[model samples]
Target: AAEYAVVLKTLSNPFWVDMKKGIEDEAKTLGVSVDIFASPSEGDFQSQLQLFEDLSNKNYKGIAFAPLSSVNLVMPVARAWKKGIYLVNLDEKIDMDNLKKAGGNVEAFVTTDNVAVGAKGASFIIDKLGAEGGEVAIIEGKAGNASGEARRNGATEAFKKASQIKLVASQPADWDRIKALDVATNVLQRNPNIKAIYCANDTMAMGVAQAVANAGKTGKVLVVGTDGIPEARKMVEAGQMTATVAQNPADIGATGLKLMVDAEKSGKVIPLDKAPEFKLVDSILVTQ
Candidate 1:
């Protein structure tokens, strides 16, 4: 007998758990229900697809989701649309073409300026590494993911302006800690002269940090990334990671809830035009 329940992609990461808390805290204050779900890991596309199917059939009147991919969730989201469930996209974006095809299927998409986040992180590395660029590698969350690709591409463009950096390798870690460590370790072997590493998320960044430390290059090579998460922030303070772009998840989720609830009462399919457009939250470069 709950008011509403929101399904997330996964909970293994502290980022996901904190986002859940944000959703729950808002729901509780509004006398609603918020439920969280996630696949085993970011790579579990099948499990995430199945969860989307389950949510389509569940009794929740509305749904808030951080989808796993731009392609994987198109059909399932269309199903949710046909059923007339209120839809909100958090974090990642679905294919705009697919959304247009659904006609009223997807509602609003909320996320940090991902391209700007990438630019900011890469800028931090450029700043620390000095004006002259050096060999750099990027750790991607997932290949072809809208957000990941945007971050990588944007960072690439941002780095190009530095004129001293060269992109030696860009590998997909899929947001797995162990995978990131493995990737970083292997990349280090292949590119011993690499001067900097940029990861798409904090979890991946931390993994890279550990891998670098194991290679005995800590403080020797610069590391930059996103998410001003607690553990990662501590790492930045400790002089491990050079910097992080903190996209305030709690504030984003709460803002989405407030806007969605307002839409529900106003009988509006789209409130973004009437309400606030994309809100650009601040992200800082943290270091010792």
Candidate 2:
């Protein structure tokens, strides 16, 4: 039983936990030890960076990380490469161009097609609202994260496909339920005619649903969300939410681990073009 080290963004997030399960499952089959580590808070990029350096000092064979921000992680990742450490970017994609110029340090990047997630939510709104669409609101995730940005773009693109729906407001929620309610509540105040609310993540969607309930329009407003997390799936089944998108975090982790192991065993750099990339994992579009 060989031991390997793995660190993730945050353990509190169920998404990361699912990904951990995937890593552990594969590690068992591969007969290697997997050491899992994470930051206490999802917002703490500085701490994550420090941990990566510590792990490198310990001389871990390989590392898998879900960076909090792309720009914040560049130096640390670059340093890891300089130290001859095998690195894989998970859940979040890093700056590939810079990595290439730095001599192709990172072996691979794995993530969900977040742009499609947002577009799918918008498509659902279009389907429900029909040709004579109604005003909509978008509950986005963090401001600069790639997934959040892509989801915002995807929703906007889908909205443009239909003339009936116009986005009244798109704001960041930081993936917090309470924060989303505050932002969405303000948006609803400005636009009383909003017919659909597309949330970037399920956590924010729950908040939006609460705000909609407070506004006395629970069932009336089409509440669409991404990330079919456990509680979120329950909300969908219970008719509290219109829909949720689920990414296969477990699959992402297992596949990334297997790929990294194979690359390490072959004593070669994993080609980016030939590496397994991210997918949407298909969303669960639930409606009552």
Candidate 3:
């Protein structure tokens, strides 16, 4: 009998929930036992660390997990590596340099190309605004997050590519919904004619959309979010927001599991010290 573990960031958002469901279904198809979990919230890194230790103590043949922050899971992963458990880094990648410093080994890594995802979100706004683009802005995620930074950079680059697009404000909202609300309001106050806003994630997108509606400019300002969360999709359907670039979290989850299974079946017995295989699942745009 073999048991594997899949740990996620949070289940509060539909993203991770769908990912969990994906892993569960994949487990059934492979006829293997799997244990899954999520931290209390996004900021609960310490709790996730503690949970990782508990899973490490058990008989997990392989463990795939997402780190809340790049560095948070380094030490735990190092410990699990020493235990000879097969490891697959999932979703948000662990800091590679830090992992090497910790003497850790991960067999494979799976994720979406955040930079490309960001560009897609920006392109949607550019097309919506036409050649004589009005003032627009970006609601960035927490500063310094690799995934967030990549997305923000990609969006910014895409905006710059379009000569007509005038980006007035680009600021970080720390990936908090209420913070995004206040940040968007501040942008509206400063640039009332702002045509659109692109948020790093659906959570902040909802906040920005709410801010637009609260300012009596829901129809005037377009909003695009990443993640295509259920609530965000609903907002898009209701015309509260314009569109979202949706990532396939289920496929991401399943791909990690598939890698684990493939490695086990191969006679080579993939070594942990070897460089990880990276796979990227594509994302798509969803509009109402």
For all candidates, the clash counts are: 4, 3, 0
TM-score of each predicted structure versus truth: 0.63, 0.70, 0.78
Best-matching candidate per TM-score: 3
Candidate that beats the other on TM-score, 1 or 2, i.e. the better one: 2
Task: Give the residue spans of candidate 2 off by over 4 A.
Answer: 1-3, 28-33, 39-47, 57-60, 69-76, 79-84, 94-104, 127-135, 139-149, 162-194, 201-207, 227-238, 270-288
Per-residue lDDT over 201-241 for candidate 2, one digit per residue giving the tens place of the 0 to 100 score: 88899999899888988778999888787787888888788
- Can you tell me which runs of candidate 1 are displaced by over 4 Å? 28-31, 39-46, 102-104, 122-221, 227-238, 268-288
lDDT of 1 by residue, 244-266 (tens): 88776776677666555655565
Candidate 1: Cα lDDT at 36 = 68
In model 3, which runs have C-alpha deviations exceeding 4 angstroms? 10-13, 28-33, 38-47, 54-59, 69-76, 130-134, 141-145, 171-193, 228-233, 267-273, 286-288
Q: 139 in model 3: Cα distance from truth in Å? A: 3.1
- Which prediction has the highest lDDT against the true structure? 3
Looking at model 1, the pairs that clash are 9-38, 10-38, 133-164, 133-165
- For candidate 3, give the lDDT: 0.88
Q: Worst lDDT window (10 residues) for model 3?
A: 264-273
Consecutive 10-residue window with the lowest summed lDDT within model 2? 275-284
Error of model 2, residue 266, in angstroms: 3.1
